[PDB]
Each structure stands twice: as C-alpha cells, then as structure tokens.
Amino acid sequence: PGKKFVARVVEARAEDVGKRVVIIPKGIKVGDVVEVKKV
Amino acid sequence: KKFVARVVEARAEDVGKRVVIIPKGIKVGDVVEVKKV
C-alpha cells in the first residue's frame, strides 16, 4: 500500500454498519474517486 | 476537493450516506486526508 490508497465513493448499506469508513462531505459525489492518505 | 477526517465506525444512521470503505491497516480514529482525483 503506502498509507495511501484510492477508492470509489459509495452509498453505505446495512451490511456496512460496524465497518471502518470515512464520511464524505458535500462536494464529492457517489462514483467519484478519492485518494486517501493516513497521516 | 480535499478534506481532513477521522475514520469512524459506520452506524445505522449512515445507511444511504456517501462514504469510502477503509481497507485493512487503517484503524478507527486514524486521521486521513482525502482528495478527489
């Protein structure tokens, strides 16, 4: 990896409850791709 | 564009909300920087 990954923004589902996620604020759409870096 | 956030445990109230799923190696409470590609 490298503390840095890419991921497609999705809509959370019932099966996601309890899973590690980051909440996506307004301005970034479902289907948009984001780069995520643990600092 | 770009934002800072902390990794959280998804809850029932998040169903239907915009999220990114966090892979293994990053824990709840970890600070991440997120930017749209």
Numbering used by the authors:
A (entry chain B): 4 to 42
B (entry chain A): 6 to 42
Sentences from the paper on this structure:
Here, we study fold transition between distinct β-barrels by protein engineering and structural biology technique. Here, we discover that the previously reconstructed ancient DPBB sequence could also adopt a β-barrel fold named Double-Zeta β-barrel (DZBB), as a metamorphic protein. The DZBB fold is not found in any modern protein, although its structure shares similarities with RIFT and OB. Furthermore, the reconstructed OB fold could also be converted to the four-stranded SH3 fold by a simple circular permutation. Thus, these ancient β-barrel folds (DPBB, RIFT, OB, and SH3) could be readily interconverted by a few feasible mutations through the missing-link fold, DZBB, indicating their significantly close evolutionary relationships.
